[PDB]
Amino acid sequence: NIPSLTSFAEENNYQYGYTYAQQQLNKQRQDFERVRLRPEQLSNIIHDESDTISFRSNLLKNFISSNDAFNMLSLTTVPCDRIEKSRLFSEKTIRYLMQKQHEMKT
């Protein structure tokens, strides 16, 4: 097949109305461009991450994540002088930067 560019012309094709070579080329045209342009009627209809995203699950997760983070704010009756600060380094990041600074003189 792989019919033509002349078979795609408007003269050899039907229009809103109101030969043999044309009716032979339009067989191969409709038999080529209906196995090429047909959509996939099976799975892999996900196509990406941002099509199977769920508004209901994210809305439920945000309803939980706002409620518990607001219960963290108001109901935690620890005064501001008593809120102890967290460490800016870990127990492993403080070992690796003692190791690499020891090995930095090479």
Binding site: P39, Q41, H47, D48, S50, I53
Partner: protein
Amino acid sequence: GYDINYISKIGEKIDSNKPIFLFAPELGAINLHALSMSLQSKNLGEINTALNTLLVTSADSNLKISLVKYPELLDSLAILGMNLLSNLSQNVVPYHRNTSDYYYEDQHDKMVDKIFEKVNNNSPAVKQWDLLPEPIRFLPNQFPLKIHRTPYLTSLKKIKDEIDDPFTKINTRGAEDPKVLINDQLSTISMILRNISFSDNNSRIMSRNFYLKRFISDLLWLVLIHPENFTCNRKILNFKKDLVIVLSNISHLLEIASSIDCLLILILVISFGQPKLESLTFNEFQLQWGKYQTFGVDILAKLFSLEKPNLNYFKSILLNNHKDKKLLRRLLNLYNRHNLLNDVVSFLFSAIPLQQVLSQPSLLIDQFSPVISQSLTSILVIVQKILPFNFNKNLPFVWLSSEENIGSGLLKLSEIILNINNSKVLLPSINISCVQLIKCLVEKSICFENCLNNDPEILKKIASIPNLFPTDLEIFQLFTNPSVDIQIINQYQLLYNLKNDILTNLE
């Protein structure tokens, strides 16, 4: 105060069984003429119930919507999408105006009626208007300030950070805001137009439709230059995600109208893919993410096939009727010489998965042969018919030696493809495309050096590519096996004759 996991578990079933709109089996005899006349009715319900009944049928894949039997539905869709793009950039609200909506409700005697205004107390001009408004450019509001080149993955992260926001407005509904009503009419228009274009007759009817080409050149301006009017950030991605699909099916017969559209096509196709932080400015897109960039390398492969207006517009854009001269020269220097050419060629060197098919052997090339073939065709068109003087930087040299060594990747890919078929249709074209691309890149590097004449020591630097230029032993192998072709070994032997002429001219 509630246990909202159980409440949402029940409300999912409630939303599933809720009577929102008709399903596919209960639509009855869909009459295309009734839909096409209701879209021109400028009502609100008659437009929306036509759009929904078109969206259900067009996505059904069992009910065909052919435009041979009725070609004026598409003009109604495109004129509606034109007139919605017009009053979105000006923030006019249709469908509920407080204007009257009606026009003039109501010889030798016109001088007698003129003096009748004298003796009772005792020639109208012409009109001019058009069918469609100006596109969306040549408007006083619309002047470019920033080409919104956001990539694919940053758009995905912006979507996932807008949905997972506490104070989100992504579900503010339709009747609570008119701007989201205009946006959800335009998204329905785009979903319909990407659903219609999967037929053999619609793809050639939509190709020869001045209304559809004007609507495409009208939306592609708005989604790239001024996307501030679209409410959500998922609608802006979804317009690009179905404009590329509707341009993938049309472009084999599309004749590009204006040069601004031919630039915005390039920017839209470039906007899929991931750049870096000269050299190749595009990291390779690994296809465990999504095949949406593979649609762009077919738009660029089919729109380069006409030397009529298409390739002339692409040439005048990549190398360099009275206001768009000012618009094109404003858009080209807003895009941050020859950044466009190396961006397009580096993106087309992406989506050829050299690293993935050469890491692990026949399945991946049998799956990705069409995208590889059309990408190599597009790069061959750009190399042979665009690159031959206003350059100031050697582009084929910084493609050949960009620390990724794509020439060695193409040569190993030609080895791989030559070692499967002789030990599944496009592969004899892909072999000759790879070898001719390497040959044309080396020859154009030497020709660009002869034209520019600033870097004399490149004959060493061309011959110092670690896996270019196949040895005489594999060509000795290729001249003995009967399972090889004639043009394959012809391209290989002229690549070797180029290799010998490197070393002769080296000293």
